[PDB]
Amino acid sequence: TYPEPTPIYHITHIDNLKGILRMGKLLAHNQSPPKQRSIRNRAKVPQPPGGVLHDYVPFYFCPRSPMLYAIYSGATEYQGGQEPILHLVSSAQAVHKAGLPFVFTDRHGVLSHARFFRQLEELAQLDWEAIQASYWADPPELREKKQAAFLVYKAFPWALIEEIAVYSQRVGEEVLKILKQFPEARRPRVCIRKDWYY
């Protein structure tokens, strides 16, 4: 079995929010998103619609990801830390109800041994205890499975985002200031969630 609804999470720097609201969508790497801050070109997707991982907008099935810990620890090229990083929240069911092409994996999608699925019933193939683990570093099988991904082909409409989660009051205020510049954009919930950060 699997959680229903099935939340999906995309992390991005706050400096990218204006470009997302202006476009009305997240764009996949290969669709040239007007990103301001960076925080897969040969990793083939074997389910339709195919292409490579950079053809999809990527989500995890958990907040507080290993990627976020690399950002927190200054391991990434980006050196601004976790506090300006938003979690944009949707659900796998909303994507499927919208008829958007998607695939998802049972583990880190860059792994040659990742399995890919295209039907929400196959969410049962994922390791939900690994996805939800707070102590995820070891063993390797667990860490790989924590990074199961939900991939939406080409573009992801802003209207499907139900919540922007933030680290702090100050970041929440900055998000509300940006949303107010786009009065016709859907206004999701804005929530401070320290338990989603390190």
| Residues in contact with ligand NAD by the rule CB under 6 A | 10-12, 16, 19-20, 23, 26-27, 29, 33-35, 38-40, 53-54, 57-60, 67, 110, 149
Instruction: Report the alpha-carbon distance of residue 69 to residue 14 in Å, rounded.
Output: 17
For residue 51 the two structure tokens come to 């292409």
To the nearest whole angstrom, how small is the minimum distance from the Cβ of residue 83 to ligand NAD?
16
Cβ proximity to ligand NAD: between 38 and 119 the closer is: 38
To the nearest whole angstrom, how small is the minimum distance from the Cβ of residue 152 to ligand NAD?
10
Cβ proximity to ligand NAD: between 25 and 172 the closer is: 25
Name the residue among 62, 79, 73 with its Cα closest to residue 11.
Answer: 62
From residue 94, alpha-carbon distances to 86, 109, 141, 183 in Å are 20, 22, 29, 23
To the nearest whole angstrom, how small is the minimum distance from the Cβ of residue 63 to ligand NAD?
10
From residue 107, alpha-carbon distances to 57, 126, 144, 161 in Å are 16, 8, 5, 23
Cβ proximity to ligand NAD: between 1 and 95 the closer is: 95
